[PDB]
């Protein structure tokens, strides 16, 4: 029998996550509510962090202390600007508190730890931004931002999977795997969203990459520089593709079907989106997405076994490989990373 607290949590998942609501709801019942809680806690954290109407003096303690708020029955927060999209999740956060405290203790420790590590990373960032530039300047900084977001989400999910025995324990002693899983998704989003992020004064592309192609970041969007813009996105795609093999190692450690589906679907969507963005000038003019018929095929190819998913990965590695052109200054490196992926899949599954 579903409680009203449970119904509220599932409702807010649907209102706050177009994509993940569907996969999360298919999860095995051992992790359905825990991952749902995990999602809403991080979503609540993000609703606070994104709201520029909350002054730093109020916001920074909320982010650092949020892990402790999960223990406070009936916790609520009405300080978001009235137009913040997800504000009502925090207004009604007491449903999340209830379901958090209903979780097995092992799950509560995982969620609270990640809330703690992420809240504090977010706080350190919001602080820097208020006083310094906080512009991503190096590839190292790029990877760190992604770790404090997607990497910690992957850490938490992995710890939940292993605790419930839905994933091989070795997934915890090789943390680059869940990091690559997370960074593959976030970097693909960062690549594809570059224009709309730029039109909201958000910039995540590291200068160590784009300054080799343009003088100022905004130059990427002028039609005069479309060719050098494509070369820039090409190196960004190259950088994301370097995670792809490790994403496959990770998927090979998953031992329960609904967990496999939950992890495989976004990864397949990511490589397909990277192949669409590669050498595609539209990426700089608008927000592009793979076609409906492609997305449908991918859902079927991601909800079976590792062999089928790897074949899908090999298919998109080959397409990128074929688009790759010698005029691109990243030509050799793109084809080498695609070859590594294809040859690795051929070795696992001739």
Three-state secondary structure readout of 123-191: HHHHHHHHHCCCCCCCHHHHHHHHHHHHHHHHHHHHHHHHHCCCECCHHHHCCHHHHHHHHHHHHHHHH
Residues designated catalytic: 145, 192, 202, 262
Return the closest-CA partner of residue 158 out of 82, 254, 229.
254
- Provide the experimental method for this PDB entry: X-ray
Q: Using the structure block, give the residue that is written with the tokens 């209102």.
A: 15
Sorted by where each begins, the domain ranges of the chain are 1-350
- CA 181 to each of CA 72, 124, 141, 194: distance values in angstroms, whole numbers, following the listed order: 33, 24, 18, 20
Q: How far is CA 344 from the centre of its chain?
A: 24
Tell me the C-alpha distance between 308 and 334, whole Å.
24
**Residue 215 has what DSSP assignment?**
S
CA quadruple 239, 268, 270, 114: dihedral, nearest 10: -90
Region of residue 325 (phi > 0: left; psi between -120 and 50: alpha; otherwise: beta): beta
Tell me the C-alpha distance between 185 and 189, whole Å.
6
The residues that bridge with 167 in the sheet, in sequence order, are 254
Q: How far is CA 232 from the centre of its chain?
A: 21
- Cβ(300)–Cβ(284) below 8 Å: no
Tokens in use for 300?
């079927």
Declared resolution, Å: 2.4
């Amino acid at each position: 029998n579903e409680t009203e607290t449970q119904k509220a949590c599932f409702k807010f998942l649907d209102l706050t996550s177009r994509s993940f609501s569907a996969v999360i709801k298919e999860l095995h019942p051992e992790l359905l509510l825990p991952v749902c809680v995990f999602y809403l806690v991080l979503r609540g954290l993000d609703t606070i962090e994104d709201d520029t109407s909350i002054p730093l003096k109020t916001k920074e303690p909320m982010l650092r202390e949020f892990k402790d708020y999960l223990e406070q029955d009936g916790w609520t927060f009405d300080g978001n600007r009235p137009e913040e999209k997800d504000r009502e999740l925090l207004v009604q956060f007491h449903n999340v508190i209830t379901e958090f405290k209903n979780m097995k203790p092992a799950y509560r420790e995982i969620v609270k730890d990640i809330t703690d590590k992420m809240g504090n990373g977010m706080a350190d960032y919001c602080r820097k931004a208020e006083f310094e530039d906080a512009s991503v300047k190096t590839i190292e900084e790029y990877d760190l931002y992604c770790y404090y977001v997607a990497g910690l989400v992957g850490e938490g999910l992995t710890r939940l999977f292993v605790e419930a025995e839905f994933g091989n324990p070795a997934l915890l002693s090789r943390p680059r795997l869940h990091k690559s899983m997370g960074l593959f998704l976030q970097k693909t989003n960062i690549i594809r969203d570059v224009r709309e992020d730029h039109d909201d004064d958000r910039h995540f592309w590291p200068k160590e990459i784009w300054s080799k192609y343009v003088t100022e970041f905004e130059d990427l969007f002028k039609p005069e520089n479309r060719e050098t813009a494509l070369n820039c996105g090409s190196e960004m795609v190259l950088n994301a593709l370097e995670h792809a093999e490790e994403c496959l190692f990770y998927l090979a450690g998953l031992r329960e079907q609904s967990v496999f589906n939950f992890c495989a679907i976004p990864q397949a969507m990511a490589i397909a989106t990277l192949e669409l963005c590669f050498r595609n000038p539209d990426m700089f003019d608008r927000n592009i997405k793979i076609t409906k018929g492609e997305a449908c095929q991918l859902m079927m190819e991601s909800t079976q076994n590792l062999h089928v998913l790897c074949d899908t990965f090999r298919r998109y590695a080959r397409r990128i490989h074929k688009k790759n052109t010698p005029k691109d200054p990243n030509f050799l490196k793109i084809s080498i990373v695609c070859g590594k992926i294809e040859k690795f899949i051929d070795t696992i599954f001739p």
